[PDB]
């Protein structure tokens, strides 16, 4: 269609899976309370100085988070944000700041359960925010205490219980700091993944999300596409809990859009093996061809699921390559013994039969590629079942030109992609340029 | 030898460790069963609805894996693969598909132990596949239940046991999803590392591999070079177990091949400090010089161990640099206070004595580098024991030219490697080019 697939296959770019394009949007929110400190009432006789030291260390961790959150809460009034008081912010910080303000309308109800949050003695409990709303409290290490320390009070010495508690708390903080430590300069954000907030509950995000009652057909893709996120909207440094707003978006199918994967196959040119350097994921919207940074997206067999639009510009030469101008397609020399030397597409086999041994199962005859050919197309109009190494493939028919193997193409320029090679090429061209100029 | 080490050392590229080159190959395989769901018989009175919800969530995770595996199992017949039915595949997917077919010959025997797999109540058990073969079943969370929940049935309330089980299962799934979730679009693969499959057993790959009876001199290098891999060959969504084929290859020493490390040392040129931009790992095979992507390989003091051939092309100018044309070697300006200013090789010290203070321990005299010199070579024909800062080094003798310090070289062009600088340099050269053209 839009990509000139026949000429592209001739330079090792075999049409791969066509995937549809999705972006997360329109999220609904829920608030959950994470208690950052366990209830040690049932082990209290043997806690010693542990909880006192724990609370001090934890306050140091949570305090700068609370501060950054308050900065926005003290600047937004009713919903107008004090741009002067904020001074410097990105659009993302401002938007998150608005979401923060709105969230406080509910955080204020949750906070009236302060004493009911303090008293929770189970890993997960149900409190009433309002008669019509529930808020759950997830408590760090509460299960550890309830099943590992409480039953052991009269089995191990009292001092050993103290040490066991101290270590459980210290390990919790060591893991907690990666996310809730100094790295979190922007707690006023709605882009922070839920798997990163669940660290406050031991990394157990499945319990967190199940507790909230969320389960959808697209749920696992939303998780691994980093679309389910949360925002810390409130921090309590006396009771040691945080209120987290969790965003549950839906995936919007982008209309007239898809991501086309190309399967890179080495090919022959001038008695050497080459691989083409083009995007192996081309994003097409309407009739526009652009690049996509799929390294930030979840790729399934059916779709590319992104948490934002990751479309990027493409040069004119690459677009011209993709639409048929193979003289514009860069190639890198293959020096490695481990590259794709063939690919299957549409039931048709595209292979470099100079670098692999292509034998026909039906006749026992070799499939011979001439020096002038890049790849051979092997389909069942020539060989119904083909052997490549120890792999036997039953082939279909090619729906493109019957003369595919009889027509040569222009092949583009050699390039080198090593980061060092890029610097070398720039300075070399620059010296040639100075001679010319 | 092949690299012009004497001229290279003069631009800050001091010969480092010569390592031999290895690639994993010829793997032998074993099948192991991982039970994805614990046996709760001894806690069954207090499991509530937990296992029912667990199984549903787990089926959602395993179901798409089973589906992708069946796609190939339904297309391969006897070993011919239905290229038409597959439609689109890479050589790697096709090869893995063949391995999958072969694996089923044994999976079919393991599956006859279905009821014996269901009944396992220990983290590791030994079942008979055939009279002459054993298959082990590794069970997720079985130890947790056997030592943490079973002994506590009459110590904690029944409801607390239910919650403890629910959390253990939920944490397991939260960790499991990173690998066995939507990210695994290609379960039909034999390149997936064993440390990634062991997640199905809590990440405990040492138990998995010990159970299989594998232990070799090269075992730890195979693990950290990502050479020990497995393939999911069978998924059972009723009994909740997977059959994993584990590949145990051997390391093949590549003949007439080595990787030469260069130790980058800053040097003086035109009253400023420079670092050379060349590959710091040069792969040499026979007499060919190429680049190696060691970022994907395990580097030990003796060898570079790769799970495939990671050789890449090198430009003519870089190769010319490495073979003695120092006018072709790019240099980047040093603006940082933390760069290597010296290196030790062969017992000989190569140092930029303009940027460091080089003092001779034997005489108390300063070692003076002139403006025309890049580096000084300090060996024991000049100073037997030398002081660089607070480091005292007893030196050997240089086996190259005695006039090393007396002979100047051409120094190549300045470059900038910042990603922004690369874009800037390209557009700047392009405008100069348009003036010329």
């Amino acid at each position, epitope marked *: 269609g839009i990509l000139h697939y026949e000429k592209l296959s001739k330079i090792g770019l075999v049409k791969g899976i066509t995937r549809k394009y999705k972006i997360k*949007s*329109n999220p*609904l*929110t*829920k608030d959950i309370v994470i208690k950052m400190i366990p209830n040690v009432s049932n082990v209290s006789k043997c806690t010693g100085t542990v909880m006192e030291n724990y609370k001090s260390r934890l306050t140091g961790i949570l305090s700068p988070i609370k501060g950054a959150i308050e900065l926005y809460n003290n600047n937004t009034h009713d919903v107008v944000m004090a741009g002067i008081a904020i001074g410097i912010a990105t659009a993302a910080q401002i938007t998150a700041g608005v979401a923060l303000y709105e969230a406080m309308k509910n955080a204020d109800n949750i906070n009236k359960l302060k004493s009911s949050i303090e008293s929770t003695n189970e890993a997960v409990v149900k409190l009433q925010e309002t*008669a*019509e*709303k*529930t808020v759950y409290v997830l408590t760090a290490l509460q299960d550890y205490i309830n099943t590992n320390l409480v039953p052991t009070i009269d089995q191990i010495s009292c001092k050993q219980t103290e040490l066991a508690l101290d270590l459980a708390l210290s390990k919790y903080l060591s893991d907690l700091l990666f996310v809730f430590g100094p790295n979190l300069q922007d707690p006023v954000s709605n882009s922070m993944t839920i798997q990163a907030i669940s660290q406050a509950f031991g990394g157990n995000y499945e319990t967190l999300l199940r507790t*909230l*009652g*969320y*389960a*959808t*057909e697209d749920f696992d893709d939303l998780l691994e596409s980093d679309s389910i996120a949360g925002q810390i909207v409130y921090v309590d440094l006396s009771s040691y809990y945080i209120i987290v707003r969790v965003y*549950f978006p*839906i995936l*919007t199918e982008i209309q007239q859009a898809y991501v086309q994967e190309l399967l890179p196959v080495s090919f022959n040119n001038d008695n050497s093996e080459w691989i083409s350097i083009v995007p192996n994921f081309v994003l097409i919207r309407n009739t526009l061809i652009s690049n996509i940074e799929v390294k930030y997206c979840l790729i399934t067999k059916k779709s590319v699921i992104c948490n934002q639009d990751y479309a990027t510009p493409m040069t004119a030469s690459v677009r011209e390559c993709l639409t048929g101008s193979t003289d514009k397609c860069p190639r890198e020399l293959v020096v490695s013994s481990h590259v794709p030397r063939f690919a299957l597409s549409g039931g048709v086999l595209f292979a470099n039969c100079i670098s692999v041994t292509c034998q026909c199962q039906t006749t026992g005859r070799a499939i011979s590629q001439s020096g002038e050919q890049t790849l051979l197309m092997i389909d069942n109009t020539t060989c119904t079942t083909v052997v490549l190494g120890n792999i036997i493939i039953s082939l279909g028919k090619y729906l493109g030109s019957i003369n595919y193997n009889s027509e040569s193409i222009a092949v583009g320029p050699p390039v080198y992609t090593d980061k060092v090679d890029i610097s070398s090429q720039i300075s070399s061209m620059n010296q040639s340029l100075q001679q010319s100029k | 030898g092949i690299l012009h080490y004497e001229k290279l050392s003069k631009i800050g590229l001091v010969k480092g460790i010569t390592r031999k080159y290895k690639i994993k190959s010829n793997p032998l395989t074993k099948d192991i069963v991982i039970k994805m769901i614990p046996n709760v018989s001894n806690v069954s009175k207090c499991t509530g*609805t937990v296992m*029912e*919800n667990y*199984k*549903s*969530r787990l*089926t*959602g995770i395993l179901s798409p894996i089973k589906g992708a595996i069946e796609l190939y199992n339904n297309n391969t017949h006897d070993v011919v693969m239905a290229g038409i039915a597959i439609g689109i595949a890479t050589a790697a997917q096709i090869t893995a598909g063949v391995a999958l077919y072969e694996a089923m010959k044994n999976a079919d025997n393991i599956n006859k132990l279905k009821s014996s797999i269901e009944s396992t109540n220990e983290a590791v058990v030994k079942l008979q596949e055939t009279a002459e073969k054993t298959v082990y079943v590794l069970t997720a969370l079985q130890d947790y239940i056997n030592t943490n929940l079973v002994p506590t049935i009459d110590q904690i309330s029944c409801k607390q046991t239910e919650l403890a089980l629910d959390l253990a299962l939920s944490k397991y799934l939260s960790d499991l999803l990173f690998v066995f979730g939507p990210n695994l679009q290609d379960p039909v693969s034999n390149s997936m590392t064993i440390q990634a499959i062991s997640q199905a057993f809590g990440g405990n790959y040492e138990t998995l591999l010990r159970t299989l009876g594998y232990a070799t001199e090269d075992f730890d290098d195979l693990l950290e070079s990502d050479s020990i891999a497995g393939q999911i060959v069978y998924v059972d969504l009723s009994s909740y177990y997977i059959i994993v084929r584990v590949y145990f290859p051997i390391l093949t020493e590549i003949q007439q091949a080595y990787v030469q490390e260069l130790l980058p040392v800053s040097f003086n040129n035109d009253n400023s400090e420079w670092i050379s931009i060349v590959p710091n790992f040069v792969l040499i095979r026979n007499t060919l010089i190429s680049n190696i992507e060691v970022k994907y390989c395990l580097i030990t003091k003796k060898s570079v161990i790769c799970n495939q051939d990671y050789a890449t092309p090198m430009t003519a100018s870089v190769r010319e640099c490495l073979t003695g044309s120092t006018d072709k070697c790019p240099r980047e300006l040093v603006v940082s206070s933390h760069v290597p200013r010296f290196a030790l090789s062969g017992g000989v010290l190569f140092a930029n004595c303009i940027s460091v203070t080089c003092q001779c321990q034997t005489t108390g005299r300063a070692i003076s580098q002139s403006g025309e010199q890049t580096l000084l070579m300090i060996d024991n024909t000049t100073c037997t024991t030398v002081v660089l800062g607070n480091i005292i080094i007893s030196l050997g003798k240089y086996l190259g030219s005695i006039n090393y310090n007396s002979e100047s070289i051409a120094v190549g062009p300045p470059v900038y490697t910042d990603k922004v600088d690369i874009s800037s340099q390209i557009s700047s050269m392009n405008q100069s080019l348009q003036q010329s053209k």
Partner: antibody
Amino acid sequence: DVQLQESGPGLVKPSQSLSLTCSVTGYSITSDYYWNWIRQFPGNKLEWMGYVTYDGSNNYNPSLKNRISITRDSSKNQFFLKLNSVISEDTATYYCARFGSSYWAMDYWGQGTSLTV
Amino acid sequence: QIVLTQSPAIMSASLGEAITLTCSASSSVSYMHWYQQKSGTSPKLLIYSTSNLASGVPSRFSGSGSGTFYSLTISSVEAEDAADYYCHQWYSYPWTFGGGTKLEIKR
């Protein structure tokens, strides 16, 4: 405290375009939630038709995907169900409902507009 | 779509006795919601997320289930329970309802 009140013609001819309006009081149609349409057939069988979200995005029941459009009018705090063309089978009581995260269910329902075709 | 079925279509119970209303799904869902429709009124959420009681719902109601099988239990059935109870899933699109079961009160 949302009162969803739907209204429209109680009778349209075959091949006419149907337009039902759901007036919402007590909450802004643009600030939150998903705004749904559901219809109940004479046999009391319930069918979900689709929704428009707070930002204007749509999600429809595939069986009638090519005949349905759910839109909003923020200035009146209303949302609308439009069917490009109606068929005799489309005789049903049409309800509007609010979907949200509190229950992950449609909780507030209107009274229903009984439509004859 | 996911088809929800609720058989038998009509059930009956005496005053004061428990009755279980059931639902089966053609494909697994994680949660099931239940709605109660009394004559002359729109369906009103009864049970949400399988086991929870909605805003104005009497303690007589409860529920459970997983995967493809769910139930709505009415303890101590009374006259106000004479309604069409619907099984609803929102797990996959389109969102669907079962045909609904009518609970008759014996007199």
